[PDB]
């Protein structure tokens, strides 16, 4: 029993890396507008603990689901720019 490794323990390196990743992601999202940042946070579940659905966000913001999908597509296209992805490249 002394030679069996516990595989569920925290590596103590992924925790700090994840904290830095969250801080960097928040810093990157601070460069966007409030609407797109809120849409991304609600859709990806970055807000508290869980993601939402497209229709739910559309109803909350009072806009058509087509508008929500277009906003998300434009935001994702913007975030694929090399300027906003160079910092996050090393985290993957």
């Amino acid at each position: 029993g002394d030679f069996i490794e516990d595989s569920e323990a925290v590596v103590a390196v992924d925790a700090v890396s994840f904290t830095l990743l969250q801080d960097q992601l928040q810093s990157v999202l601070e460069t966007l507008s409030e609407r797109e940042a809120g849409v991304v946070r609600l859709r990806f579940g970055l807000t508290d603990g869980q993601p939402r659905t497209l229709d739910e966000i559309g109803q909350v913001y009072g806009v058509t689901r087509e508008r929500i999908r277009q906003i998300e597509s434009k935001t994702m296209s913007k975030l694929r720019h090399p300027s906003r992805s160079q910092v996050l490249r090393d985290y993957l």
């Binding site: 991304v40 859709r43 990806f44 659905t53 998300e72 597509s73 994702m76």
Partner: protein, 158 residues
């Protein structure tokens, strides 16, 4: 039924848009033979459906540049759906009926189409077949007539 045909068309739209990188609204409408409103509704329905989990980077995403359609994430839709027995049989029957008609279509093109379709669908000798493997009965007048029709040139007929 109508719903099944709509589902087949909606599922096969993605490979069609992948084949043509910047197909416009008019070209898509002509290809699918549907009205503008119906095509717009189908495009909207296809836009908001995709991979399980339902993340904006997981479901199907497009890129609208003015009045052009492009695919950025096929969500696993890479090839069109296969051909059912009924439609393939109908196409083969139509081709083998029109190959024997003189002047409407080149026999070589019809034979090539038959061979390619049979190879693609994997049919065997238990399907509709023609009478002559090689006609060779054309005196060349049909080819001249077709060339005159295509090029709009004067023709002399006895």
């Amino acid at each position: 039924s109508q719903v099944s045909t709509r589902l087949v068309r909606l599922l096969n739209m993605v490979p069609y848009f992948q084949a043509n990188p910047k197909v416009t609204r008019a070209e898509a409408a002509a290809a699918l033979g549907v009205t503008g409103k119906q095509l717009d509704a189908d495009l909207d329905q296809l836009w908001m459906c995709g991979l399980p989990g339902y993340s904006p980077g997981d479901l199907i995403d497009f890129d609208f540049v003015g009045d052009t359609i492009e695919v950025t994430f096929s969500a696993g839709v890479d090839h069109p759906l296969r051909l059912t027995s009924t439609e393939a049989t109908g196409i083969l029957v139509a081709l083998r009926a029109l190959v024997d008609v003189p002047g409407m279509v080149d026999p070589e093109a019809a034979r090539s189409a038959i061979a390619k379709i049979e190879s693609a669908v994997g049919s065997q000798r238990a399907v509709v077949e023609g009478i002559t493997e090689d006609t060779s009965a054309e005196p060349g007048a049909a080819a001249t007539v077709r060339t005159a029709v295509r090029e709009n040139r004067a023709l002399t007929l006895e």
